[PDB]
């Protein structure tokens, strides 16, 4: 019930990698850049954006496991350990890969979004594969 990994990573990665500089991404059939506030897993019950949440469910659903190499690992580690509020959960293996189990409230960011989708599209689509 969202965009396609391939494009997802494309738009999300295009903003973060050069437009948002690792910020919060808004989802809803498209990806947007959030710099005003931020996030913290919040499910909009406190003071978050329905976007982040949705993006979290979409980025978490698409992955549902993936494998995250060394990059995606440091990826979540960065966006997660960046500020605070533990929302993403991770476990490493794959020699140089890790498994992404994340949530702890529904709210995602541009980086985190691209992170899981990097491993998502990587292991799932990879330049559109499904």
């Amino acid at each position: 019930m969202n965009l396609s990994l391939s494009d997802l990573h494309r738009q999300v990665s295009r903003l973060v990698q050069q437009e948002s500089g690792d910020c919060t991404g808004k989802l809803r059939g498209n990806v947007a850049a959030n710099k005003e506030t931020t996030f913290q897993g919040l499910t909009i019950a406190s003071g978050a954006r329905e976007s982040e949440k949705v993006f979290a469910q979409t980025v978490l659903s698409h992955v549902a496991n993936v494998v995250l190499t060394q990059e995606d690992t440091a990826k979540l580690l960065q966006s997660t350990v960046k500020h605070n509020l533990n929302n993403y959960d991770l476990r490493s293996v794959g020699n140089g890969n890790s498994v992404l189990v994340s949530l702890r409230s529904d709210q995602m960011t541009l980086q985190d979004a691209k992170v899981l989708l990097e491993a998502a599209l990587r292991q799932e689509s990879g330049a559109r594969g499904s």
Binding site: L3, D7, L8, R10, Q11, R14, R28, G29, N30, V31
Partner: peptide, 7 residues
């Protein structure tokens, strides 16, 4: 609906 095109 939401936005037309992403990116």
């Amino acid at each position: 609906d939401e936005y037309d095109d992403p990116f």
